[PDB]
Tab-separated table of C-alpha atoms and ligand atoms in Angstrom:
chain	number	residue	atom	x	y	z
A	5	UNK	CA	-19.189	-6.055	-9.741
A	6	UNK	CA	-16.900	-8.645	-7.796
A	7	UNK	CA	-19.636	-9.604	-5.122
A	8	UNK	CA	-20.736	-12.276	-7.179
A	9	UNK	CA	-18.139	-14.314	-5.200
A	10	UNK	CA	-20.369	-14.867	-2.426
A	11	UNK	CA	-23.137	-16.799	-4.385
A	12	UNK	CA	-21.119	-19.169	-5.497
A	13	UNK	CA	-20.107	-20.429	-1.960
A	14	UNK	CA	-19.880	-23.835	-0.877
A	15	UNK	CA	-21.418	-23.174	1.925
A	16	UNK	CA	-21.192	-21.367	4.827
A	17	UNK	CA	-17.191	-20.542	6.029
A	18	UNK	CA	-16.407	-20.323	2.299
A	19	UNK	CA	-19.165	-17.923	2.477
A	20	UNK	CA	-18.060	-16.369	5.834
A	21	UNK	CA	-14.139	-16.251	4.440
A	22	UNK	CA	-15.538	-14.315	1.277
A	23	UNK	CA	-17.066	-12.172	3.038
A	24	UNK	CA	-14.416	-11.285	5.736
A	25	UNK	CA	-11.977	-11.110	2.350
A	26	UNK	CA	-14.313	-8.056	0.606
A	27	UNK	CA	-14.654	-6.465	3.868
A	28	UNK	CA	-10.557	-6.918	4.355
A	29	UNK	CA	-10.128	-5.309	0.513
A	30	UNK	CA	-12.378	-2.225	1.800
A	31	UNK	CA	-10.088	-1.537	4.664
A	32	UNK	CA	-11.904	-3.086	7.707
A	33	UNK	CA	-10.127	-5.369	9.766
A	34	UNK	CA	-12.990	-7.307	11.605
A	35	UNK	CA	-15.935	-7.745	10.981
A	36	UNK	CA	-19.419	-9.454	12.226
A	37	UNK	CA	-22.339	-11.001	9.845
A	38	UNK	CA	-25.592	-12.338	12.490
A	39	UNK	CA	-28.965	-13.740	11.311
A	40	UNK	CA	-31.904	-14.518	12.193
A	41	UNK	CA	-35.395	-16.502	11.172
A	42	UNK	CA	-37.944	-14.955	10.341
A	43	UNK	CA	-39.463	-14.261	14.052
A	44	UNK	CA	-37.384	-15.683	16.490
A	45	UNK	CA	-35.856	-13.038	18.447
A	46	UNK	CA	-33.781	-14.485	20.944
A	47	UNK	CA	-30.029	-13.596	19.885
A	48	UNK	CA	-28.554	-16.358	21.080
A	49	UNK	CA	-28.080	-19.635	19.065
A	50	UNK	CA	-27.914	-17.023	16.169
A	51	UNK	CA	-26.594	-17.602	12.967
A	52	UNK	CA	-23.136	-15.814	13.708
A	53	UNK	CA	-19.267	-15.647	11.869
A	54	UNK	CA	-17.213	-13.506	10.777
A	55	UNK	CA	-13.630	-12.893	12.177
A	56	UNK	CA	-14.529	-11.147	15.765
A	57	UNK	CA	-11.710	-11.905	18.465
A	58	UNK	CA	-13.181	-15.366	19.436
A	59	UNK	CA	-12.270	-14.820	23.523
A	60	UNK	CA	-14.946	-11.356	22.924
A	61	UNK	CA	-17.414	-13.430	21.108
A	62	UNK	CA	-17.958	-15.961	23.067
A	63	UNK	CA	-17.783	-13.573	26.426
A	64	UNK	CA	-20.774	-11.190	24.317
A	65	UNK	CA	-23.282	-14.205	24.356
A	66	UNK	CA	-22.465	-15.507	27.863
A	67	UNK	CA	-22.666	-12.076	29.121
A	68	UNK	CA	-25.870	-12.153	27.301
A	69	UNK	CA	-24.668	-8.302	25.484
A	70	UNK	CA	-27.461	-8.837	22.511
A	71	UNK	CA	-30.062	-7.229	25.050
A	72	UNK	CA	-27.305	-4.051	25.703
A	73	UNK	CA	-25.961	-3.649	22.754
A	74	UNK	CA	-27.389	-0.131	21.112
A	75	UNK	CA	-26.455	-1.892	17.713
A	76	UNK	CA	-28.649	-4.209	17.390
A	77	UNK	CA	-31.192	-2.743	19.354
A	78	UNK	CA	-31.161	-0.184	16.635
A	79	UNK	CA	-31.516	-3.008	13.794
A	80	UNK	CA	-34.772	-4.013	15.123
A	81	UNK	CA	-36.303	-0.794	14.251
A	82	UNK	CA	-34.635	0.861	11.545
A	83	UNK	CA	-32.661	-0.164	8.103
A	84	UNK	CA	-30.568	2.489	8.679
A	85	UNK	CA	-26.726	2.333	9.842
A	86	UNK	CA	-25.588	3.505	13.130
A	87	UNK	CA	-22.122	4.711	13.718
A	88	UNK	CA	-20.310	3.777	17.254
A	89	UNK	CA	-20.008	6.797	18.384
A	90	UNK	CA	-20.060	7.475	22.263
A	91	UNK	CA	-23.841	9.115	21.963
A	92	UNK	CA	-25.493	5.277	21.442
A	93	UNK	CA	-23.989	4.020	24.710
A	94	UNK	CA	-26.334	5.531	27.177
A	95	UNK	CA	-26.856	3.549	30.116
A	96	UNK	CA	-24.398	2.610	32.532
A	97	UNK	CA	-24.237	-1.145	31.204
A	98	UNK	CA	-23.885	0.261	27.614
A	99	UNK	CA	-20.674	2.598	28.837
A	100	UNK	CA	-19.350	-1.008	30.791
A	101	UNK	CA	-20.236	-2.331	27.363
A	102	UNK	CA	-18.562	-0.077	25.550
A	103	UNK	CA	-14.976	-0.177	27.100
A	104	UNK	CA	-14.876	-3.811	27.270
A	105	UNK	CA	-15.628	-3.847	23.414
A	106	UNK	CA	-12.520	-1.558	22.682
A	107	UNK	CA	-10.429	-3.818	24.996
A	108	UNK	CA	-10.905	-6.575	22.155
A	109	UNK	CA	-9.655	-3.816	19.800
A	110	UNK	CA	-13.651	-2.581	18.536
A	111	UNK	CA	-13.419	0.922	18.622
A	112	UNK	CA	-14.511	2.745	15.546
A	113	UNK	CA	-17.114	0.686	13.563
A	114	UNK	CA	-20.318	0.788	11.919
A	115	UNK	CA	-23.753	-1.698	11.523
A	116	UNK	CA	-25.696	-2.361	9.052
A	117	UNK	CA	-29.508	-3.533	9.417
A	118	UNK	CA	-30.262	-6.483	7.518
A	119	UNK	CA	-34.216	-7.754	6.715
A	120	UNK	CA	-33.884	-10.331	4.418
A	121	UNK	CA	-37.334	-10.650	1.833
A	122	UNK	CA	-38.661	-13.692	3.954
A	123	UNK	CA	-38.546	-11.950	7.398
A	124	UNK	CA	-35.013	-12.618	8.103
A	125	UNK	CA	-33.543	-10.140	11.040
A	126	UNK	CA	-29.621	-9.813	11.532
A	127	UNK	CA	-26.709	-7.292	11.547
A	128	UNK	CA	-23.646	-6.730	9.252
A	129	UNK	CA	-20.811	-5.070	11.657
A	130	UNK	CA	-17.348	-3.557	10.324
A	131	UNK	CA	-14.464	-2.583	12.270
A	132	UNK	CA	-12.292	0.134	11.341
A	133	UNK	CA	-8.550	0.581	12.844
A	134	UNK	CA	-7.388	4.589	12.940
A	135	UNK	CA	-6.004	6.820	15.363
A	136	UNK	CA	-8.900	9.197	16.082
A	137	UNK	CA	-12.806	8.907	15.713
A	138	UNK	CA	-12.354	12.276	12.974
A	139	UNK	CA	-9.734	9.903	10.767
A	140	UNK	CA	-11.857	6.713	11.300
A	141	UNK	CA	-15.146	8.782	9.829
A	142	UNK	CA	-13.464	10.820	6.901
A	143	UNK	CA	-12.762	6.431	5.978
A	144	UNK	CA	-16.386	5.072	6.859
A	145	UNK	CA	-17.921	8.044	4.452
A	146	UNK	CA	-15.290	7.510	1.997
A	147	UNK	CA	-16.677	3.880	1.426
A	148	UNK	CA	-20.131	3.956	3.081
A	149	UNK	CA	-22.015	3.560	-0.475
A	150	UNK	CA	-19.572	0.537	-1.461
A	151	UNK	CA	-20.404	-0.682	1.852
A	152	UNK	CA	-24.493	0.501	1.465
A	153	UNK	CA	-24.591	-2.429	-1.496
A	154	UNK	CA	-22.576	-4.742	0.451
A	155	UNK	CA	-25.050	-5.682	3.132
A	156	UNK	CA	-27.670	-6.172	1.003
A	157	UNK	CA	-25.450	-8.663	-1.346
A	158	UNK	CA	-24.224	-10.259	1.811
A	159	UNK	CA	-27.852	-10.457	3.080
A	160	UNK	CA	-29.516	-12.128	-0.242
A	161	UNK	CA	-26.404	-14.955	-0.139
A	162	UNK	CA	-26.259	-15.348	3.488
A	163	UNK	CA	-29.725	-15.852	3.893
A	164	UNK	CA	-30.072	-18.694	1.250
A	165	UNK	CA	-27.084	-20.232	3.502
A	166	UNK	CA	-26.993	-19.076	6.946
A	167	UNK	CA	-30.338	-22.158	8.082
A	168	UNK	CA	-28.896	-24.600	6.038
A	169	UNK	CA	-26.980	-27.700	8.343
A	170	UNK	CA	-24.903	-29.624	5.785
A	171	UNK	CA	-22.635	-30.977	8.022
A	172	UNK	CA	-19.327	-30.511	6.104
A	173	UNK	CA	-16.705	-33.303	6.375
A	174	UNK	CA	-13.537	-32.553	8.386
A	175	UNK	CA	-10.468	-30.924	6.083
A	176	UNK	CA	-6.652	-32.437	7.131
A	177	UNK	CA	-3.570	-31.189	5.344
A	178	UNK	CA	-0.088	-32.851	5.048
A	179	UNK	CA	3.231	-31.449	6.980
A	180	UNK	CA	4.151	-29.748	4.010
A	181	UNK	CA	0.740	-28.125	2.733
A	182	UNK	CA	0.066	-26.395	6.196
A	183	UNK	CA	3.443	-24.819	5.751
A	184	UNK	CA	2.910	-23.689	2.300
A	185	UNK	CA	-0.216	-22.635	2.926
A	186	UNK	CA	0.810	-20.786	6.068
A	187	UNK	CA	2.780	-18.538	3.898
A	188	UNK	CA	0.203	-17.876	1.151
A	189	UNK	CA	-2.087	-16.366	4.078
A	190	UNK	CA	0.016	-13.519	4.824
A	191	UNK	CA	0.573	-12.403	1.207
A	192	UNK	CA	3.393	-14.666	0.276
A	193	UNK	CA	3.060	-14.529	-3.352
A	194	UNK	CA	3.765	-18.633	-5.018
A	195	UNK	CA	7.276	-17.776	-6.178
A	196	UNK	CA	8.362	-16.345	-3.133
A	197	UNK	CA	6.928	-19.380	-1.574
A	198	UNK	CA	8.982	-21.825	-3.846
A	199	UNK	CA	12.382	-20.107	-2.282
A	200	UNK	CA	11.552	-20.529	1.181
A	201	UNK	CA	11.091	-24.608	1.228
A	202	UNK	CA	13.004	-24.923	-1.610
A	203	UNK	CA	10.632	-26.522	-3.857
A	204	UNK	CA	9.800	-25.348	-6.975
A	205	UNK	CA	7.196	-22.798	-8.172
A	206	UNK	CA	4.979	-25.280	-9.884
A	207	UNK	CA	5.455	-27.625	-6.348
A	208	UNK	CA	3.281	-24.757	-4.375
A	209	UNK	CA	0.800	-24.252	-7.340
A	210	UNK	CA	0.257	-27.939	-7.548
A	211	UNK	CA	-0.212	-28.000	-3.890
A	212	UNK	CA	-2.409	-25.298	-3.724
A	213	UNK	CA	-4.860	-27.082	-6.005
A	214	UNK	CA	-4.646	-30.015	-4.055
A	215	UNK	CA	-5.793	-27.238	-0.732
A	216	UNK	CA	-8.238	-25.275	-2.605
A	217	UNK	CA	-9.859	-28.438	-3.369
A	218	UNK	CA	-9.501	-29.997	0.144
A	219	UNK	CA	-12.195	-26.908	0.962
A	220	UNK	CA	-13.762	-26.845	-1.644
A	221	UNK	CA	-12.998	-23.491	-2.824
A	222	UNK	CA	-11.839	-21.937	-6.377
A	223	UNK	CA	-9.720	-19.161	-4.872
A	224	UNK	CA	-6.662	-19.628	-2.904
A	225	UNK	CA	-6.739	-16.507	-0.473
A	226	UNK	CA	-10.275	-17.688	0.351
A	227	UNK	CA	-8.784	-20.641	1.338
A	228	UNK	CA	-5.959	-19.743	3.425
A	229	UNK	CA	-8.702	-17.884	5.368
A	230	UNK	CA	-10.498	-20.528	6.298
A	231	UNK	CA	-7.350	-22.023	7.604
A	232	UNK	CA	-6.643	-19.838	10.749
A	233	UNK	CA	-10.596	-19.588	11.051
A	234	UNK	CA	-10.695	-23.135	12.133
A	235	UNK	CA	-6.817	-22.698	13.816
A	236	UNK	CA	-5.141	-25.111	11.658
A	237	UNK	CA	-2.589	-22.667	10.908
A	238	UNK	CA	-1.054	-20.172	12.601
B	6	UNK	CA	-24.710	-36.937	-12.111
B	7	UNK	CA	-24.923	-33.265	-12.259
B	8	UNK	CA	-23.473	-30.066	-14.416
B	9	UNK	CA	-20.054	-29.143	-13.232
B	10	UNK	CA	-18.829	-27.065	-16.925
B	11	UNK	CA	-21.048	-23.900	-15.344
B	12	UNK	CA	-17.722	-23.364	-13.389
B	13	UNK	CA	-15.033	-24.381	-15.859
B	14	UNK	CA	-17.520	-21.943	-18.502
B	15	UNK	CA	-17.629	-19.454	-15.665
B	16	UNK	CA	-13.994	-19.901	-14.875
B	17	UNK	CA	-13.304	-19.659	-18.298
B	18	UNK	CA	-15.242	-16.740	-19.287
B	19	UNK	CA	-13.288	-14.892	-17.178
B	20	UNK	CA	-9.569	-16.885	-18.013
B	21	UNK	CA	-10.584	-14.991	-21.430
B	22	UNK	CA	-11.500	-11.719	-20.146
B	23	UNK	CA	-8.478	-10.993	-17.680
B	24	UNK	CA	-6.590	-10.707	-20.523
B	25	UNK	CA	-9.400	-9.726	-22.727
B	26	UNK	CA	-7.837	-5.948	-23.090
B	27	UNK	CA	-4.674	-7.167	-23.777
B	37	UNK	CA	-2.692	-8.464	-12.396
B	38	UNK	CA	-5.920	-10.773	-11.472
B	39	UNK	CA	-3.764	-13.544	-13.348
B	40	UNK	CA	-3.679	-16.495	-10.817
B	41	UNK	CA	-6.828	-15.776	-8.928
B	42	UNK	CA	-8.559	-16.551	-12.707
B	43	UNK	CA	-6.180	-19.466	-12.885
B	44	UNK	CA	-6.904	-20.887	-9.605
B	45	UNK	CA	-10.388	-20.298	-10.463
B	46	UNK	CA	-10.346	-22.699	-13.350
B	47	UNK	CA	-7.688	-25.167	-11.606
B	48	UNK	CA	-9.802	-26.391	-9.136
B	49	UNK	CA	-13.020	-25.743	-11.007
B	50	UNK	CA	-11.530	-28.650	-13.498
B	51	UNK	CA	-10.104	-30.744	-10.639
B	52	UNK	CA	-14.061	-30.332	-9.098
B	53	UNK	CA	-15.463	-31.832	-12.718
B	54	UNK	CA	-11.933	-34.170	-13.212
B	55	UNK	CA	-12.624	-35.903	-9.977
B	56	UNK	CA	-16.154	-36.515	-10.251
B	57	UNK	CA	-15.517	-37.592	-14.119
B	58	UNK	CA	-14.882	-41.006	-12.710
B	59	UNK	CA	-17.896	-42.589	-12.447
B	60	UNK	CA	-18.309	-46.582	-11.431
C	5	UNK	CA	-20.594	-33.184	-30.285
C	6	UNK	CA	-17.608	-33.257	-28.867
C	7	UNK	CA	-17.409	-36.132	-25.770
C	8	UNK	CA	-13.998	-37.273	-25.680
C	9	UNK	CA	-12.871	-33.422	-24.539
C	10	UNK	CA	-14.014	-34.568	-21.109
C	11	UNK	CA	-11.903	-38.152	-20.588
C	12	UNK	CA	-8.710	-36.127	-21.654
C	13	UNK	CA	-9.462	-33.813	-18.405
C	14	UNK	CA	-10.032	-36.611	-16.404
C	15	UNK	CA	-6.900	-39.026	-17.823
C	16	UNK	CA	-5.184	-34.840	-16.800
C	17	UNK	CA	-7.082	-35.263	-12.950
C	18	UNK	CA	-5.760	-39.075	-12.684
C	19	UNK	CA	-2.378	-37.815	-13.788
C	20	UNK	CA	-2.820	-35.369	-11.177
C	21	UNK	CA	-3.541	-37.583	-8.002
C	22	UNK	CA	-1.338	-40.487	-9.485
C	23	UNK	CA	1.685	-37.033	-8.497
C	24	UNK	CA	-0.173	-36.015	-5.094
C	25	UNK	CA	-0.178	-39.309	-3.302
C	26	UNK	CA	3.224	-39.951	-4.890
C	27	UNK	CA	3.995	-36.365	-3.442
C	28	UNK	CA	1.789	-37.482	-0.132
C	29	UNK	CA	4.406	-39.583	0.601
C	30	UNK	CA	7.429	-37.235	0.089
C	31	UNK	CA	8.298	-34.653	-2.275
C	32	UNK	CA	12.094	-36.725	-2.628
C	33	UNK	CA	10.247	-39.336	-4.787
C	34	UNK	CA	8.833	-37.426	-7.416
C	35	UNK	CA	10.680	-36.004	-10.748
C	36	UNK	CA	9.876	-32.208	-10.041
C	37	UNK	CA	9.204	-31.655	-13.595
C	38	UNK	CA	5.709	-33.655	-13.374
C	39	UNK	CA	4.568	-31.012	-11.115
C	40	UNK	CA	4.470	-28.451	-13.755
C	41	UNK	CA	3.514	-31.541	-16.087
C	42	UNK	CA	0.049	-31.665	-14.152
C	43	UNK	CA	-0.293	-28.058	-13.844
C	44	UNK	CA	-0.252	-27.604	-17.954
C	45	UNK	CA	-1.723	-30.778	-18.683
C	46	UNK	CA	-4.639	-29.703	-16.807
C	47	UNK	CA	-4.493	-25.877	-17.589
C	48	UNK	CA	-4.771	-27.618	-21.577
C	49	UNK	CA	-6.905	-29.957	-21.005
C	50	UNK	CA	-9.452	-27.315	-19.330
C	51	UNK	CA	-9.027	-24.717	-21.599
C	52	UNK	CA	-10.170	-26.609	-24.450
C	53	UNK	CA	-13.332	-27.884	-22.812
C	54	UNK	CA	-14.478	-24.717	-21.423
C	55	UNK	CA	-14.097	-23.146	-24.886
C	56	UNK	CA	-16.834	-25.789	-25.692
C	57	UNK	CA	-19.707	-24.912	-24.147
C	58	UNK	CA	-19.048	-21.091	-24.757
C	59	UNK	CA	-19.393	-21.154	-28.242
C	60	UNK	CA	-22.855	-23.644	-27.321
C	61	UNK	CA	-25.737	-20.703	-28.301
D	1	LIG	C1	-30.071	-8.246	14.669
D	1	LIG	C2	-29.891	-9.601	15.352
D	1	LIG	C3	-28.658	-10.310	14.795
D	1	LIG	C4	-28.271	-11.469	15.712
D	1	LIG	C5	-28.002	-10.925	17.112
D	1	LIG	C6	-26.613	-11.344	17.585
D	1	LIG	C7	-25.565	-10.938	16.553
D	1	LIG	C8	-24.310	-10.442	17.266
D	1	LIG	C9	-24.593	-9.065	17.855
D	1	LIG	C10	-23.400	-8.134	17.640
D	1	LIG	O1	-22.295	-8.557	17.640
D	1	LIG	C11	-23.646	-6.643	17.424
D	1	LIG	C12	-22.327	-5.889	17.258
D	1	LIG	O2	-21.823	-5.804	16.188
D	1	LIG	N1	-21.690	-5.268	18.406
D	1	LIG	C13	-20.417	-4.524	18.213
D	1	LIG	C14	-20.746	-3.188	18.026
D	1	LIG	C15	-19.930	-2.317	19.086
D	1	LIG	O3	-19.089	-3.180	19.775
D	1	LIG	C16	-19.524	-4.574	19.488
D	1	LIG	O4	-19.240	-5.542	20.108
């Protein structure tokens, strides 16, 4: 049903670009995947991707937000989603928490518990851009069971990869396959790419083999996601 | 020394069924590009 | 049975770095028409190893 992408991942930002890709093609825009072992419950040093503004993820753990934050409160004691609507922010931290989160763009959303079969504890977080709350819900119930078989998919695959450290070598690209490459990111389909640097058709194909290789991936959208995840284009 | 046709045969398997009812064209293509280039590359050996 | 299926995809992956390092240096220096050389070479040479194994029980 498609999500066998995600076990067949090289490892874990081929996995993490899959799985930002399936939650792109539902209509999210960002999105969170965090994990766990078995019993450790301090949040931080987490197992933790996804495509979150970087400048709010990195203020959320030195603000220390996993002990605030009503989501994954909630995923610590129930396997049930909760919806970010104004009722879960409570206290006045929460409400501080709260508008600081839609000032990096989080407004309407949704998590997902995740308890992986060994004990695993983490959350699956999707971000949904609309106008109003009433538009952004009429959406999350129109895909909610699409997105009810997601976590657990993303759960069973993340969890065989998330505690694995394979150390992956570092991936440099030539002058000309950044710029290539840079186009096939936003949507540039390979012809219209062959027009643009005037090159030929089968010039970008054969160079896109030569990236989706570099990473170590078999599709070429999963690859040109990896690219601006590690800000070597764009 | 290691199996590396599960892709190609994976890759393939579906080469032959996005056209099996005769718009996924290049994704199944780039599939089993770099899923030979994967087996190519490791077919040299010492 | 079939074991020299697998040399003809790799003889198609030499032919294809033999064109990127040749293309690493600059795209000027390589007959354009060997790009879509590699591309069918190894589309071919893939196709008919693939349908190997599938037919394999
Ligand atoms: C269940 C433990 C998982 C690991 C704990 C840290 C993961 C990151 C926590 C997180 O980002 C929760 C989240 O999605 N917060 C969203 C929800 C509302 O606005 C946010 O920033």
């Amino acid at each position: 049903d498609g999500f066998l992408e995600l076990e067949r991942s090289s490892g874990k930002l081929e996995w993490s670009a899959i799985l930002q890709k399936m939650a792109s093609d539902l209509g999210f825009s960002k999105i969170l995947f965090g994990l766990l072992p078995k019993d450790s419950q301090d949040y931080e040093n987490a197992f933790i991707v996804g495509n979150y503004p970087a400048a709010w993820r990195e203020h959320y753990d030195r603000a220390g937000y996993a002990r605030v934050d009503p989501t994954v409160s909630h995923c610590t004691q129930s396997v049930l989603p909760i919806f970010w609507e104004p009722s879960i922010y409570q206290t006045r931290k929460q409400h501080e928490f709260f508008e600081e989160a839609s000032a990096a763009g989080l407004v309407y959303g949704l998590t997902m518990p995740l308890h992986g079969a060994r004990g695993e504890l983490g959350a699956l977080s999707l971000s949904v851009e609309a106008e109003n709350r009433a538009e952004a819900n009429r959406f999350m119930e129109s895909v909610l069971p699409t997105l009810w078989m997601l976590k657990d998919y993303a759960l069973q695959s993340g969890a065989g990869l998330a505690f694995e450290h394979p150390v992956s070598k570092p991936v440099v690209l030539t002058s000309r396959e950044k710029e290539v490459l840079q186009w096939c990111a936003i949507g540039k389909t390979s012809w219209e790419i062959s027009v643009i640097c005037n090159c030929s058709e089968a010039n970008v194909n054969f160079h896109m083999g030569n990236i989706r290789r570099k990473f170590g991936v078999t599709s070429r959208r999963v690859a040109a996601i990896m690219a601006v995840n590690l800000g070597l284009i764009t | 020394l290691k199996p590396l046709l599960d892709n190609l045969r994976n890759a393939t398997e579906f080469w032959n069924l996005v056209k099996e009812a005769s718009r996924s064209y290049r994704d199944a293509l780039d599939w089993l590009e770099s899923a030979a280039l994967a087996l190519g590359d490791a077919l040299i050996a010492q």
